[PDB]
Design a protein around this ligand. Structure first.
Ligand SMILES: Nc1ncnc2c1ncn2[C@@H]1O[C@H](COP(=O)(O)OP(=O)(O)OP(=O)(O)O)[C@@H](O)[C@H]1O
Ligand SMILES: [Mg+2]
Lengths: 471, 578, 51, 468
């Protein structure tokens, strides 16, 4: 038409919802603009429709709205975001508007933010090993390109510093696999849900220090921003990441700051609609909603791009059985779990190796990729550490003097393992140095009890002294 | 205005009809008595109003009038040295009017309209002014109160009142378009006040308590939470911070607590002395009181009024400290209001939007550059009183995700009278790293090293205590016995502090530094003496232990001589012994 | 010594944990009963009153 | 004044009943209900609308029908008539006399919900009260205007300690220097959910002591309706406030069992189908309890005072139950009894470690009790706590590892319990109690006694336990 239609029959405003009764023309899932009587425009999304009435959720706050003057206008039927290659180095808010003072982006394409599932035929196996520079991740919980590897954190634990260090130090090793020329740097897409000024300032300073803002795209949604806007931020971030990776052959690394806040907003919307709850408070469909976010990563046959995700989430009472960590561990391809007890002893990074897991480790290790002894060394380290922890629990009861020689050896191995292997500070370690330290630690035990390593590898590498590396 | 009548009453919830045209979160006048209410729902021709006063005796058919404006406060001269109700009503005027009981329906002004204030102009006619600029100064109790343009105002000025005495409601500046600017302006309490930039906190917030200043510091412009069961010492800690901290203006919010805890502050404070100006302590303090037997719905309003006033004093360039007595009562008020609306609740009946409110409240704190160009800061310390005494209740968990420091109290330490009863094992602070450049240049160059040594000694004592409990203290070797005794000396003499002693209530940074130096020097000497083969009892029978124990009771003036004498005594005693 | 330690320290702690867990589970069952009451009341209202 | 009747009653369901056209019933009013047999019930209005009003009945609804039941009107604010002639009388939970004497003549009528006190009108509690119990008097002292409950278990003698406190309560004006002059003292006793045997015990004790002339008793037995339990403490507090703030009396209020009050509150809330709280109790229990406890205190410019001593029973022994937890957040301390001390025969079995009194610092010091009271109390607390820890260590490990100092601490702990806590029916003064406390501190080395001065011991030294 020459001028667009407006709907005025609004009789309900309560919380985030809003009912309009003359709106059968609005498509399900459409985006609308809510006009105040003073001229202010607020956005909203339609999730119900009938010949009787329609239900609209509001992104911004509902202060100042009235039932006599408010009107609803129509934007396009599908939530679409305009993307371009020119948007590298820009900053955006939670809904995609610029906040850096620069003119807006002229779109090359406009894409639906909900995305589409990847065809399981069109995928391929993640293979490339990524050297993060942290021994407890490189050796025992290896990260490969194309993996979803969330970080399970507490309240006072430093997950942000670990994420920044990984993003700074991450690189591939073409020389080990023989793939030829060195890579190009990762492109970082940073999506922030409800985040304090302290964490945001730290992240901005860290990215400015290394010059990574020229490659990055930032979607920011602060703690004082409206809550319902957090629904759209991960979807827009992943739309941009998918476009860059699969249309321009970039290697994209995506960081999601706190999935807990996203789940809180989701619970707010679900409880407003009287949905059937899940276990504690959260709606019953939360598994499906999280699955549409995580499962957008991976690699695609016949294309050079890749998408890697590092979500960060906080287990509330350090509880692994909470619904959010449970569903995340069901969907993702592993987890890195931080330990508070190691943090209290001054160990950084405080990664607890036993609850940690990497599902796609076996694709990226072995001969011709890193080295031939990687997997057996990892297994032996795991078994020895478990024995050390069990002997700790034993000497908590019976006392140190009652120990034999074997239990004392395992106990000393566990202590030295923590102090030297885990505690590394801000230093950067290559894979060879980490393997050398791991072999030096295993040399504290007799050859008889390490049954998980083949005798050739023992004959080749066993016998190193730790004093040469640390003295 | 919009006018309608009432048809439903249930507790503090009133439903009005005929209100077509009312806006969300406005303010309404309810009934013949003229109560205060706020609209949070709209449905057809009806509106849902929560009432901030008692609703007994109301009947169907009483009129409801809408003011068309949200809940706002009056910001201007005259707020200092005052005690206010939960919706900013002066309590002494209410006492003068009604008597000793707080009846509903009393209408008072927030600022005194009949006091003369001295006015000194700054601007000239023809000048261009913007939001947040300074135009004029007014003398207050030691301070200089600045008159600020409201943030959403731009224009040019050609009218200035000359230097004289005027009330708060006389136009002192007239803009070109005809806008008249007075000494005060109103601001809605739910909107955050604008700023230019936010800065990283880099200077400490000195509290006067040894354990909080040394082990778990909080920076100027940060946030902190102090949970604990009943009888742990939250209120005494907050009042000590109000007495002794170096903030320019202290705002104290009592949200659903005892009335005696507010009467004590009202009576005792005018007799004390301001640490940094020398005047009465009450001249820098603003009190907002809403006790437990006052109406429930007014608890939220008190919190928002307090944070709005603290934000206002920040824009003048001051450094403001805000203390909330309990946020659990605010959570209970939200639970009650949602229960009247029949919303589906989250865990323990709290509404699902509980965490968003806490996030929005704590986000007001920070060190900023004001619109006028000065630098201000607001720091927030909020006490959590979990009725579900375990630390897994939703309020505590939602608080821990935004705060920067976490001071955890223990009921076990409060039983044996080990105040402040701070659990140093479960507590943490994230501001330690940033304050080190200030500590190195303002206190001493080796201060972080001594702090690290003290923490190491505490950790080793913590392990050896479990060893002792499972075995016994006799089976321990001499080194472990020495570590246990030094840890006990630390816990008794350094960490512990009496808030009602005349001298022990306040401790400078250099006094804590001297005590730490004495303890570590003793530990080093006793460690070297064990190599010589001396018995552990000969160390413990030394009279120098008494000197360290009494050291925290020494005054600030006498302390350096005491410290030097004690160092000489330590050296001589450990030289001559054995 | 072993008998005294087991009788004094371990058993009361285990008993306290048991009763705490029982109380939490009872609270959760009560809350879901309230939710079921509300949804039944909602179901029976919309089927009869509407014309 | 003329009355009004509504006969349009078409709903009855448990405790609630609806009125068809009651447009002029004020919210929170009181109504009386009359059926076809002439029996009259009471009810309170908590709803109103253009279409119906909801009334919950103060008792059972048996015998009501929609054809004959009519609802009348009583005054819209729950009011009680008070006078000075209430002294020496007995009433039920609704205010009717149960002594058979003619009804009182009301001086004034006051609302039973009260009004909030203005914090500007309050003043600090400052007058110490000597009760004769050494654990209370020295370590957890009681000040006029304080709300200090007693935390009891099941099967512990809380009522006997309450009666002993009621008899032995006295102020010490000689220490303040004003000299001894008479002051009007009175006791308001409110018993809710009380059985016949304990009722007879209370009545007999009060008649034997001779305090029935100056007392007012509100009684509520276990067979009464549950609304009278709710309305019982409010009427007692209204009477206490009237007496203290109009006739300048010094009133002491005793509430027999708040556990029954909380259980009655749970019964009422659950019948109206509202969201539950932490343990089945309603989510507004904190405010409801705060409207009761916060009525005590003192007022600037008025000579009267109100003092509250609630008694509650913990479920087994546990803290963190909703009743003692929410009580501890409102009151200004607690006196907690110990089952271990009662088992071995020590009376009164007060445990000093969890006991607390917040207003002690305002009522002690020079010119109030003595120059050394606070420091003595702190040293006793620290020494006793250390002795208890060492005793636990002994019980776990054995007597072998002890030094002489730990044996000194054990002897201190045993002596402190046996002499200080056990007093039977004595009426000990403050000064002899401080002498006994100093005698206990003489067991420890003088070097360990930090944070005190030695002129305090310099004139009261060398005493043993002279009672033995
Ligand atoms: N630092 C201290 N120095 C001396 N006494 C203290 C100290 N901290 C606490 N106390 C004592 O313990 C009591 C604790 O009371 P306080 O009001 O501080 O507790 P709270 O944890 O805030 O409780 P509530 O939840 O009831 O408000 C004080 O009244 C005082 O007697
Ligand atoms: Mg307190």
């Amino acid at each position: 038409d020459l001028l667009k239609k407006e709907y005025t029959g609004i009789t309900y405003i309560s919380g985030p919802l809003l009912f309009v009764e003359n709106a059968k023309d609005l498509a399900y899932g459409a985006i609308v603009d809510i006009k105040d009587g003073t001229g202010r425009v607020r956005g909203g999304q339609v999730i119900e429709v009938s010949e009787e009435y329609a239900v609209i959720q509001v992104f911004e706050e509902t202060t100042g709205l009235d039932l006599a003057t408010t009107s609803v206008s129509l934007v396009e039927d599908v939530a679409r975001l305009g993307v371009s290659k020119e948007m590298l180095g820009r900053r955006f808010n939670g809904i995609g508007k610029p906040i850096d003072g620069l003119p807006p982006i002229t779109p090359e394409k406009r894409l639906p933010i909900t995305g589409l599932p990847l065809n399981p035929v069109a995928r391929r196996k993640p293979e490339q090993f990524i050297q993060t520079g942290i021994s407890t991740i490189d050796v025992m919980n290896t990260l490969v390109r194309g993996q979803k590897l969330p970080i399970f954190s507490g309240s006072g634990l430093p997950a942000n510093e670990i994420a920044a260090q990984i993003a700074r130090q991450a690189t591939v090793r073409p020389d080990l696999s023989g793939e030829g020329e060195k890579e190009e740097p990762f492109a970082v897409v940073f999506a922030a849900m409800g985040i304090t000024q302290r964490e945001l300032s730290y992240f901005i300073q860290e990215f400015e220090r290394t010059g990574a803002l020229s490659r990055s795209v930032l979607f920011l949604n602060k703690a004082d921003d409206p809550t319902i806007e957090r629904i759209l931020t991960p979807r827009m971030a992943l739309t941009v990441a998918e476009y860059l990776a699969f249309e321009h052959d970039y290697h994209v690394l995506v960081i999601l700051t706190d999935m807990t806040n996203y789940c809180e907003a989701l619970r707010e919307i679900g409880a407003a609609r009287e949905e059937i709850p899940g276990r504690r408070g959260y709606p019953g469909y939360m598994y499906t909603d999280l699955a549409t976010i995580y499962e957008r990563a991976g690699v695609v046959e016949g294309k050079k791009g890749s998408v890697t995700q590092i979500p960060i989430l906080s287990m509330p009472d350090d509880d692994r059985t909470h619904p959010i960590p449970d569903l995340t561990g069901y969907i993702t391809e592993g987890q890195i779990q931080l330990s508070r007890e190691l943090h209290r002893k001054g160990i950084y990074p405080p990664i607890d190796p036993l609850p940690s897991l990497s599902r796609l480790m076996n694709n990226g290790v072995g001969k011709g990729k890193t080295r031939e002894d990687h997997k057996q060394v990892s297994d032996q380290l795991y078994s020895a550490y478990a024995n050390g922890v069990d002997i700790r629990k034993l000497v908590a009861i019976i006392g140190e003097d009652a120990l034999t020689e074997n239990d004392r050896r395992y106990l000393q191995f566990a202590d030295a393992f923590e102090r030297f292997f885990i505690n590394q500070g801000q230093q950067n370690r290559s894979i060879e140095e980490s393997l050398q330290i791991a072999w030096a630690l295993l040399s504290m035990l007799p050859q008889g009890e390490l049954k998980r390593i083949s005798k050739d590898h023992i004959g080749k590498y066993y016998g190193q002294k730790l004093e040469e590396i640390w003295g | 205005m919009i006018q309608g009548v009432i048809q439903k009453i249930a507790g503090p919830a009133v439903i009005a009809k005929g209100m077509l045209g009312a806006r969300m979160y406005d303010i309404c006048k309810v009934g013949e008595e003229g109560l205060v209410g706020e609209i949070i729902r709209l449905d057809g021709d009806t509106a849902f109003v929560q009432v901030y006063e008692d609703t007994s005796g109301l009947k169907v058919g009483e009129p409801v009038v809408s003011t068309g404006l949200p809940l706002a406060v009056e910001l201007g001269p005259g707020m200092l040295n005052g005690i206010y109700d939960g919706i900013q009503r002066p309590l002494e005027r209410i006492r003068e009017k009604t008597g000793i009981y707080i009846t509903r329906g009393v209408v008072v002004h927030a600022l005194d309209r009949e006091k003369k204030w001295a006015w000194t102009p700054m601007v000239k006619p023809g000048d261009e002014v913007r939001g947040g600029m300074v135009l004029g100064t007014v003398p207050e109790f030691g301070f200089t109160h600045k008159i600020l343009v409201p943030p959403d105002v731009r224009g040019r000025v050609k009218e200035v009142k000359p230097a004289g005495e005027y009330t708060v409601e006389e136009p002192v500046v007239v803009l070109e378009d005809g806008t008249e600017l007075k000494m005060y302006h109103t601001w809605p309490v739910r909107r955050a006040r604008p700023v230019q930039r936010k800065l990283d906190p880099n200077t400490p917030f000195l509290t006067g308590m040894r354990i909080l200043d040394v082990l778990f510091p909080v920076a100027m412009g940060g946030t902190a939470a102090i949970p604990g069961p009943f009888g742990s010492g939250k209120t005494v800690t907050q009042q000590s911070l109000a007495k002794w901290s170096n903030a320019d203006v202290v705002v104290y919010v009592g949200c659903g607590e005892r009335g005696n805890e507010m009467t004590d502050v009202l009576v005792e404070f005018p007799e004390l002395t301001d640490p940094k100006t020398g005047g009465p302590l009450m001249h820098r303090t603003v009190l907002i009181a809403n006790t437990s037997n006052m109406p429930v719905a007014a608890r939220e309003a008190s919190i928002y009024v307090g944070v709005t006033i603290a934000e206002y004093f920040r824009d003048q360039g001051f450094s403001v400290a805000l203390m909330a007595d309990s946020t659990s009562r605010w959570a209970e008020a939200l639970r009650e209001i949602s229960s009247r609306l029949e919303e589906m609740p989250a865990e323990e009946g709290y509404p699902p939007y509980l965490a968003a409110r806490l996030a929005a409240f704590y986000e007001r704190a920070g060190k900023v550059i004001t619109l006028g160009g000065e630098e201000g800061a607001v720091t927030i310390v909020g006490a959590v009183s979990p009725p579900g005494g375990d630390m897994s209740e939703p309020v505590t968990q939602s608080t821990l995700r935004i705060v920067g420091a976490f001071w955890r109290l223990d009921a076990s330490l409060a039983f044996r009278r080990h105040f402040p009863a701070i659990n140093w094992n479960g507590s943490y602070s994230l501001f330690t790293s940033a304050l080190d450049p200030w500590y190195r240049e303002n206190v001493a160059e080796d201060y972080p090293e001594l702090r690290d040594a003290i923490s190491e000694l505490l950790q080793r004592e913590a392990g050896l205590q479990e060893i002792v409990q499972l075995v016994g203290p006799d089976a321990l070797q001499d080194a472990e016995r020495l570590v246990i005794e030094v840890g006990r000396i630390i816990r008794e003499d350094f960490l512990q502090q009496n808030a009602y002693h005349e001298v022990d209530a306040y401790c400078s940074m250099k006094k804590a530094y001297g005590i730490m130096k004495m303890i570590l020097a003793f530990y080093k000497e006793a460690e070297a003496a064990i190599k010589r083969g001396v018995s552990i009892d000969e160390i413990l029978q030394l009279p120098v232990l008494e000197r360290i124990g009494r050291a925290r009771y020494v005054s600030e003036e006498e302390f350096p001589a005491y410290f030097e004498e004690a160092m000489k005594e330590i050296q001589g005693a450990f030289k001559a012994l054995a | 010594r072993r008998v005294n330690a087991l009788e004094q320290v371990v058993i009361p702690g285990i008993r306290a944990q048991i009763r705490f867990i029982q109380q939490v589970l009872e609270q959760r069952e009560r809350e879901d009963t309230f939710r079921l009451k509300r949804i039944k009341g909602k179901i029976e209202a919309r089927e009869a009153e509407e014309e």
